Design a protein around this nucleic acid. Structure first.
Ligand SMILES: [Zn+2]
Ligand SMILES: [Zn+2]
Ligand SMILES: [Zn+2]
Ligand SMILES: [Zn+2]
Ligand SMILES: [Zn+2]
Ligand SMILES: [Zn+2]
Ligand SMILES: [Zn+2]
Ligand SMILES: [Zn+2]
Ligand SMILES: [Zn+2]
Ligand SMILES: [Zn+2]
Ligand SMILES: [Zn+2]
Ligand SMILES: [Zn+2]
Ligand SMILES: [Zn+2]
Ligand SMILES: [Zn+2]
Ligand SMILES: [Zn+2]
Ligand SMILES: [Zn+2]
Ligand SMILES: [Zn+2]
Ligand SMILES: [Zn+2]
Lengths: 131, 131, 131, 131, 131, 131
DNA sequence: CAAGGCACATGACAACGGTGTTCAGTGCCGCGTTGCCCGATAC
DNA sequence: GTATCGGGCAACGCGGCACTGAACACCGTTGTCATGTGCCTTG
């Protein structure tokens, strides 16, 4: 995840930390794992780099029911939606043409110019149910 | 509009206020409008009664980009998704079995036990462009 | 270290954490320890509670070489000075009237009204020197 | 105050500015003084030249209450401690064998190998009261 | 001059300072002027707010021969060009349709998709010669 | 390309290197190209030669957005303004009496004594879109 | 004597990291008060 | 004796004041990258 600013070791460390992890992790916990791993970057830098990466579109952002935001470096750059587990944080990418066609169908039948669809699916894993 | 607690004029007034207004209103602006009406109900009471109504399912909730939660009552008790306009706030009840089938198919494919879908689409209103 | 305002759990947790340890620690290290202990207190509130305690005189504030302010709940409530080991963080309680008398002597000789001595003896332990 | 680097007019100007004034002044205020005097030297160069002098020992570094580090050129070459008035900024150098004796006694008693002591006393001078 | 961020006294002060001045001023010169006016905002926030205002398009950015950029608020919102006096910093709004027409003519004859025109005339102030 | 200094093969090689090239290159890139050719000329001498040529008037300079100044030998000695591409960088000499006449007209009607104007326009190259 | 040419230095802008404001929502003890039930009492 | 009604009393309600916490804004200090001196050497 390259950052559009001038190359520096804090950006490199944050990008590598996103690369290693594949789960939706908040800014605070991401800073916590950076702190305990040894890179030792600040928290406002984590905010700033994550926000810039989200603006550039390198990582996808999700809003949890609590009110915080969580980040993750998706494997595919194509537009997709996510299946997430609150108990584990695991996310898998899913794409469906049917929901897209429904979206523009509804937009056309209401006559709106352009629309933005936010579809998030939340579920519990079968392994999580097992104890 | 029955509530879990004992009926009172304050909760009756807030239920009526939700009845007339058909737009997403946050708790603060709802309280301001109610005070403008003249009932002068406490803000914390409005907060807790809105939370109770949302829990009971009579009122649907939506988390905006800023973070404040907006509340209004939907005429149809059946499950549906709401279309919203930022420039107007108009809300229309839209339902489609296709997204339900897509979500349940993904849940069956990935072995998740039970899932909940939160599908919200944001678009630009038709008359907003006209000026 | 009771707080002037209403007692609450987010402040009782901070007080308990301060009473638990003896080393100097900043608000952000203390916040991490509080979080990983299982209390989940916000950082701004940790900062505010430490500021209030230091204003009331319950805790002793100190600035490291780098300039970040650290705190500690000391056993003795009387006038005292601290011996610190930056490699280990243990603080030793030492008090001397000679430096006080020197302070009044210098103030009287140079005619100053009031005096505030900031005396701090940094050091390295014999055990620390051993490898 | 010779500077470790090659002789240049930027170093000469910063050294002359340090020599002219007798009050503890920060790097940001020293730069403004130089800018008004006609030097036209950049701020980063002032920062790094003051650091070079500080590690060279030719200047005495100090920290203000709010965290900014201030500097002053003291003519006395022997070890000494400073008495500074916050309202005026005027500083008078003082020295007392009592603090050295106490530091040596504490180091001997508690077994610390080597120590470093910081002793600064803050007070208001006579002219502050006069008005 | 509102800023895209939350309203604060630092942004208010920098906006008022830009409103008062009629000549081009850099970031460091404006910071010095605003420091001597007594508002005392930092230089970093001056940089950030000026870049935010330039991005919003409220102020005009001009690069001098030395390479530094100078900002000034222009009352006329319509696109125009500037005539400046490097001896004073004065600016007078000026516009010409012939240059713009030549711009699309040259772009079309060489088939460039879109173009941007940077025309800046540097002149000697009328009263500068008089002495 | 005569040089104000004594003729030597450093200046000869620099003049030749500017001779074959037709694209705008900064001094560091020109030095890298010359080193690749194997002449092994110092970078400070490269600067000195380029500023000497610019003062003499053989070459023309424009300043990039980042701040780098690029030198190029224009075939036409007459005063003209250059169109350059963001990526391709090809330069075409375009001149128009209209902009000049505008410049002296404004200088006269505002009474400016003498004016030094710079005209440079940026645009997206024709074949850049084609891929 | 002057140009060549290193090593090290410079200065406007970008980037960093400990602390501090915002502003929508939560916690708690002071009250009122609905609601029931027994006491009195009219019949 | 049977009867409705009033009042005591509890167990819930309201509700203003102080507190909270994730996100955004801050000021002093350090870093990046293209260009500029001090000083030694050779034509
Ligand atoms: Zn994604
Ligand atoms: Zn799971
Ligand atoms: Zn989609
Ligand atoms: Zn609904
Ligand atoms: Zn649905
Ligand atoms: Zn609309
Ligand atoms: Zn203590
Ligand atoms: Zn003492
Ligand atoms: Zn130790
Ligand atoms: Zn001194
Ligand atoms: Zn001493
Ligand atoms: Zn004084
Ligand atoms: Zn303008
Ligand atoms: Zn124009
Ligand atoms: Zn002028
Ligand atoms: Zn040319
Ligand atoms: Zn021209
Ligand atoms: Zn091109």
């Amino acid at each position: 995840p390259p950052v559009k600013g001038r190359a520096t070791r804090q950006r490199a460390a944050v990008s590598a930390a996103l690369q290693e992890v594949e789960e939706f992790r908040s800014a605070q916990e991401l800073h916590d794992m950076l702190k305990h791993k040894g890179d030792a970057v600040g928290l406002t830098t984590v905010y700033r780099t994550l926000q810039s990466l989200a603006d550039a579109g390198e990582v996808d952002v999700l809003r949890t029911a609590e009110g915080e935001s969580v980040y993750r470096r998706c494997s595919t750059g194509d537009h997709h939606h996510h299946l997430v587990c609150r108990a584990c944080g695991k996310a898998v990418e899913v794409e469906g043409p049917a929901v897209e066609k429904w979206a523009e169908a509804i937009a056309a039948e209401h006559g709106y110019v352009n629309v933005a669809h936010t579809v998030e699916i939340f579920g519990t894993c079968a392994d999580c149910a097992g104890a």
